[model samples]
Target: SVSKANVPKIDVSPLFGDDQAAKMRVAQQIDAASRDTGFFYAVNHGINVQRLSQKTKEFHMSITPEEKWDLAIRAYNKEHQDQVRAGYYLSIPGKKAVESFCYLNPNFTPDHPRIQAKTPTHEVNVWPDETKHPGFQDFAEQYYWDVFGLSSALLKGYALALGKEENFFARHFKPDDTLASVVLIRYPYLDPYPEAAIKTAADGTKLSFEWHEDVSLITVLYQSNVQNLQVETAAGYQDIEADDTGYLINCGSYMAHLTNNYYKAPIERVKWVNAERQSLPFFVNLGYDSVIDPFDPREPNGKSDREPLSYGDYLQNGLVSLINKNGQT
Candidate 1:
C-alpha cells in the first residue's frame, strides 16, 4: 500500500480567493501531476468530509445486507428501471456494487424541460422513495453541490496552468445544460464471504473496480477509508488510502481531449474484499451541445487539425455502450 505522501498534496484554498500567486503555485503542481500520473490530492478544498462520510455511511449501513443485495439484483435487470434518461445507474456484478446518481447542476432540476428532453447524458437521477430514505437524498445532493464548487475552483487553477484565463473552462459550464453527475456507491461485504471471490489478481491483487480511466472531464473522488484502491503508475499499481487532510482528484479523458493530450488521465482500479467500499465521485462534464475541436487552423501554426466532434454525441455513445453492457447490442 502507498502512503498519502505518494501523491502530490496541494492546498487549494487560494483557488477560492484573489491570490494569483498562490493559484499559480497550485497550478504548477497540477501541471506536474498531470504530466506524469494525472493524479493528485487536495487539502482545504472545503468540502465537509466528516459529514459527507457519516451520512453516506449511514445510507449504506441502513439497508440490511439482504436488502442491499436485492437492490443490486433489481437494478441489474435492464428493463423498465428507466425514469430519468440514464438516471439512477447500477453495475459491476462481480464482487457487486450498486451506485445511485443525481445531477449536481443547480440550474436544472431533474424534471426540467431540458432534462426531460432526454438528450444524451441528460438522464434524470433515480432515488429510493423519499419517505424510505428520509433525508438521504438531501444530504447526498448537498455534498454533490459542495464538491461541484470545489471542482470549479480547481479548474480555474488548471486554466492558469494551461496558459488560458482562469475562467477559460468555466465558460464550458455556463450553459444551463452543462451536466454533472454525482455518484454514491456501496460494494456489499458481509461477515461471511466465499473464498473464490476474494481471490487476488495474477499479480496478487483482490478485485473491486476494474482497470479503467474515467470518461469525464475530471473526477473528484473520496476513497471511503477502504484500501486496495490502486492507481497505475509507471512503476506499477500502488494503493491510495483515504486521509483526513485530502481527497483524490484525477484528470479524465475529456480533459485530455480538451487539452489536445497536453494533460494525462491514468487508469485506476479498486480491489479489496475484506471490507465494504463506498466512494463518492463527482464528474465534471461539459454541456452536451458543446463541440470539441482538437485544433484550430485559424488560431496558429503547429497545432492540431483533427476533425471536430460533437461532445454530446460522443459522450452519449459512450454512455450507451456502458449502460448496455449487461445484454443489449
Candidate 2:
C-alpha cells in the first residue's frame, strides 16, 4: 500500500510508448491509487508545463495595466462584473480564491447557436480583447488543443484501469463531441473577517475552496510545488506537492459512478497559508448524449440494475444545479 504521507506518484510516460505491459502497469497504478486514495500524481505524460506557464502569463498579463488590478487579479465593480466578462472571459468571485477564466470546448463555436442547440450545456468562451491582448487568441487556442489531446491519452489509461477495452472511453469522446474547460486559478493569502467566515470546515482552517468532488469524469491538474492542495485519504487528509514536471490526476463523481466505487471521488479542498498559489485544472467531460452504465459489484443479483443517464442531462440537471445552489455565479 502506498503511504499516506505523500500522494501516490506514477510515471505515465509508458502510456505513450509501444509496450502493452508497460501501459497496463500504468493502468494498474491508476486502479490502485483510485481504489485506495482517489488521487495520484502522474509524470512524463507529454504536457509541456514550461510552455503552459509561459502562455498562462502571456494570456493573463495581456490585460491592460488599467484593467490589470480589476481584470487579472481582482474584481472591480460587482454590479458590472458580469459585463466585464460578457461571453467567455470571467472572474470567479470569492474572497479567498479569486480565479480568472478561459473556457474552451472544441465542439462548439463561442457565439453560434445551431451547434449549441445540440449541446444545451455549451457556453461561449470569453477571451481577452484583441486590442489589449494581441496574440492571446492564438496562444490560448493552441494551448487548449495541446492539453485536450494529452487528456484523451490519459482517459484511455483510465479505461484500461477499469478492465474495459482501451478505447471504451475514447470511443465516446471525440473532438467534435467532447468539452473541456481550462481554468487558471490564483489563490492568494486571505484576511478573513472571523464573523463572516464559514467555520464549518473540519480541516480547522478557512479554506479558499471547500471539500467537493469535481463534476467532470476525470480532472487533469497541472501539478504545482505549492503544498496547499490536499486530497482525502482513508486515514485523513494529505498535502500534495507535485513538481511542474507532472500532473495531479483525480477521479470525479462521474468516474466513481462508472467504476461502481471500485474508484471513488473523495472530498478535496485547498487551504492557502504558505504562499500565493496558482494551478491549472482541465475539466474533461463526455458528449452530451453519451450514456453511462456503471458496473456495480454491489448488485448481488448480477443484473444491470442502474438506470442509464445521459451525460448532457447529468451536467445540465445535476452538475449545473449544484454549482448554482452554492451561489456560484
Candidate 3:
C-alpha cells in the first residue's frame, strides 16, 4: 500500500464507463482486496455528490447545532446512551442499544400492520416531519434512491469479482439485506491511548477503533481530510494518512470466507495518530438474514475456524463490543 501521504485516490469515474475493461478493473481490484477486506472506497462513484451535499447539509441544519450537542452528550454520557437514540428515532428499542439502528433488516424495527417492508425502518430514519422541515422528506427521498442504486452496482461488482454471474450477489442478498448508519465522523487529537484500550472511541485516535474487523461486505469511506484511518491487512495494520478528497479502502471478513482466507493483504503499521480526521462511511453488507456460508443452504453455525457466520453475529458482536467498552461514551 502507498504511504498515507500518497494513498491511492482512485478515480472510479471509469467504472461508470460502458467499456468491458472498466468493469473488469473494478472486478479485479475487488477480487484481490476482497480476498482480505470486504471494504473499499470508490472515488468518482456515479453518485449525485452535489445533490447529496445540499440535502445532507440541510439535514445538518435541520438539527440545530445546540440540539446536536445535547443529542451527543446524551448518547455519550450514559451507559445506555444508545437506548436513547433508539427511542428518538425508532418504535422498537432495538436489542441492546449500540446495535441495529441499521442492522440490515426491517424486521429489526416494528412495522405497521399494513405498512410495506419497503417502508424504511422506523426510528432510525426520520422524514422531513413536514411540521419541522417541509422539504426535508422530498430531498431525502430523492437522495436515498440514489444511494440504493449505487448500492446495487457495488453488490453486482462483488458478485462478478467472485466469478459468479453479475446478478449473483443481489439475487442472494436482497436489497433490504441489511441497514447501517452512514456517519460523517470527525475528531481532534486525544491522549496516546484513548481510554485505557477502550473508553469512549472519541473518533480519531491512531489504532484505538480496536483490532476488530468490519462487518460489511463493502464499506466505502472517504478518509479524514487531515489523517487517521487504520485497516488491518496481512502485513499488519497500516496507518492511513488522509487526503483532502480521497476515499480509504478497508477489507472485510466476508471476502475472507469466499477466498478461503487466502485473498487478504493486511496493511502495514497498525497504529493511528491522535489528530483531526473526517470520514463518511457507508456500512455495506449481505442482507440481514443472508447466510454467511457459501455453497450451502444452511444458516451460519456461529463460531468455528472454518464455519460461517450470519450477519447477525457480526452485527451483534460490534455493538456488544461498543456497549461493553463504551456504553458511557
Candidate 4:
C-alpha cells in the first residue's frame, strides 16, 4: 500500500578533499538528505566493493554451520547479552531466520586495559581459526579500519552540517577505542513461509527483519543489490533500491537524540525474499566514555537543558530495550 521513492545518492568524494567550499556544499546536500529521507546512497565512498563482496562470499561459504556454532557468542562469554561481541548469532530462529557474525573494534584485545578492567563496550573480538579460515581475520580487520576511516570522514561532514567545527565529532570518537561494530548478516531464502514463521506488522504485512531503528550514531550498509529493504517515510513504508556501487547511509537513534530529532532515524525493515540476501552494516558508535549532549544547529554554542549520559550506558540501555522488545533471552 506504500509508494516507492528513490533514496538520494550523494557523491562523497568532495568530503575527502581539502576544498572547504566544495566540502560545505556536499555537507549541505547531506544535511538536506538527512532531514528529508534519513537515508542516502553514499557514492565515491572509496571502498573496494568487489573485494569486500568477494571476501564476504568466501567467509559465508567457507564457514560451516558447525564452525559457526564453535565461534558462537555464548561459547565465548556465557554472560554476554550486549550485541558488541565478535561471534555468531541467530535472531528469532525460524521466525526471523537471520544469522550474523558481529565484530567489535579489532584493536581491543584481551590485554587492553579497558578489556582487563571489563569496561562495558571495550570487549575482545573472537575470530575463526586462522588455519581453517585463511585470511578471514586479516581481511576482516582491514575492512573494519577501512570502513572506520570513511565513517570518520562522514562524521566531519555531519559536524559541519550541525554548525560545529568539522572536528567536533572526531574529538568524541577515538580512532582506536571507539565502540563501533561491524556485522555481517545473512537472510536465508524461504519461498513458502509457514504460518508460524512469519512476523506480521501492525498493518499485517509480513517481514523478514522486523521494523526498528538502529541505535548507533550512523549505519553504513552494503545491501548487495537486494531489493527487500523498505524504509518508513511520511507516506508509509517505501521500497529502497539497492545500489551496486554505493553504501546506504542512515542516521540512527543516537543521531536523533543528539540533535533533538533534527536528523531523523528512519524506521526500516526487510520484506521476505525468495533468494538469499546478505548485508554488511558498520555501526559507527561514539567512544565509550564520550558524553552525549543535545545540540541545536541554530545555536551551536547554546547550553543544553537535557541531561547528558555516557555513550557506554546509552548503548547498554538501547541494546537491552531491543532485546526486551524482541523477547530475546
The C-alpha RMSD in Å for every predicted model, in order, reads 4.1, 4.4, 7.7, 2.5
State, as a TM-score between 0 and 1, how close model 4 is to the true structure: 0.91
TM-score for candidate 1: 0.82
> Over the stretch 1-329, how does candidate 1's per-residue lDDT look in tens digits?
44232678888899999989988998999888877677788898777787666666677566554443334322444443443332344534354344553444555666677667755455444455677679976776677667777888888978887777898776775536767777666666655555444535556766644566676777888756666677787678877666644778888777766666777677787676556666677777778777755642235562765656666776666556545642220
In model 2, the clashing pairs are 88-125, 88-126, 89-126
Which has the greatest lDDT?
4
The TM-score obtained by model 3 is 0.63
Overall lDDT per candidate, in order of appearance = 0.66, 0.65, 0.46, 0.78
What tens-digit string does per-residue lDDT give for candidate 4 at 214-319? 8798898887777888888878888888886798998988888778778878998877766666789998898788886786655556655656768888888887
The better-scoring model by TM-score among 1 and 2 is: 1
- C-alpha lDDT (0 to 100) for residue 263 of candidate 4: 88
Ranking by lDDT: 4, 1, 2, 3
| lDDT score at residue 87, model 2, on the 0-100 scale | 30
TM-score of each: 0.82, 0.82, 0.63, 0.91
What digit string (tens of lDDT, one per residue) describes model 2 on residues 244-323?
A: 77788887777777766667787787654534456788877788788868786446643445577677767666555555
Error of 2 at 300 (Å): 9.1
Clashes of 2: 3
Cα lDDT over the full model 4: 0.78
Q: Give the per-residue Cα lDDT of candidate 2 at 260.
A: 67
Over the full model, what C-alpha lDDT does candidate 3 score relative to the true structure?
0.46
Residue 82, model 4, lDDT: 40
